[PDB]
């Protein structure tokens, strides 16, 4: 909230304005590296994506069960 300089009292709310050193970390799609560019690791990427895009798209297989889902 906003507040006076001498008589500290609430005066007006205000949003959460983020810092420039954080918005910067938002990203383009400058990355250009397909999963064919990487060798081995068919498992680890297979294990990974069963934590990421499916919960992003196909979480119903979790949510119908409603199992204790993973976070990261």
């Amino acid at each position: 909230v906003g507040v006076n300089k001498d008589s500290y009292l609430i005066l007006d709310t205000l949003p959460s304005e983020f810092d420039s050193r954080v918005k910067a970390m938002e990203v383009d799609e400058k990355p250009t590296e397909t999963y064919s560019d990487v060798g081995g690791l068919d498992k680890q990427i297979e294990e990974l994506v069963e934590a990421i895009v499916l919960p992003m798209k196909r979480a119903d297989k979790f949510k119908d069960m409603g199992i204790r889902a993973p976070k990261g």
Binding site: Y8, L9, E50, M65
Partner: protein
Amino acid sequence: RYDDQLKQRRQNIRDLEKLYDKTENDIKALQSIGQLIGEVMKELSEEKYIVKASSGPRYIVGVRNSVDRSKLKKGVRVTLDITTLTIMRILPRETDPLVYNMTSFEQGEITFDGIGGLTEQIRELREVIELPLKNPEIFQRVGIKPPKGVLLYGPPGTGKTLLAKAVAATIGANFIFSPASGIVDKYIGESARIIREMFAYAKEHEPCIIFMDEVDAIGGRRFSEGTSADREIQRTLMELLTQMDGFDNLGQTKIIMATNRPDTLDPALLRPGRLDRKVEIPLPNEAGRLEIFKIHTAKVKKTGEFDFEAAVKMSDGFNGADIRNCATEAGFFAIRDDRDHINPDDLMKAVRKVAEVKKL
């Protein structure tokens, strides 16, 4: 015709009397400028106290007419003006429900506690703790002094936070619990104020039980160098001890503590007579794991089988709290095969990864 033109007006006016009183309220507040917050060290006379602000210094002050000089004592939180620095008002109950919260139904006297793993413990704490609370007028005339406190040590990953939460709930005791993190995480140098409030609040709601984990955090330096920078890590042990000594151990307040590293504990106190009874705790065995897996796995749409028996016999060197993971270690493969009712094949290869997970 000329009646409706007026009938909208009696509505109009009252729709302003609401409006006015608000705009007249706020100005009645803006003159009442802000204040400043402190805390007390000691007392000298009704004309002069001492304070300690929330921005350093240790002023000396006086006090206004209205407030009772009685309630003003040590530990209290205080408010006062900016120029003259004269104390007027108090605010107790430094609420932080993320810290603690009551379990009144734990004063039910018939509550459920039927998870698996452990029976003689819940059987014996009932001996350790029931009798001094319900009719303790006998421990005196027999002669002995009952235990002011308890300690519950063991290995990590065992699910004891829910245990102590439970057995004080079946007995019909008012249970409250606060970790020793936020009191030192949220509150760096304003901590021990919470301690004494955590007891006074607990007192007038007598009887009641305490529980508090991560208790090895109070140590900090533990006077590792005796410098005056760790006063928080020092005093936070002090106010703990002085308060628990103040109970008189009558039988309407008892205390529980816990950690993994009792060899890391601070026996500067809490060893001799405060946390007198020390109690280790075991891990499961050839059937407890089915007493455990009958809990979590029972709560999800599997196929329905009893590979548990042939399973756990393959399991060994197995801690306790890795079991919420073990089921979901398999749940992450049922959905892969696009399934609803899983099979034990996920379970027969469940731990096959998990055993390597214990490596690091």
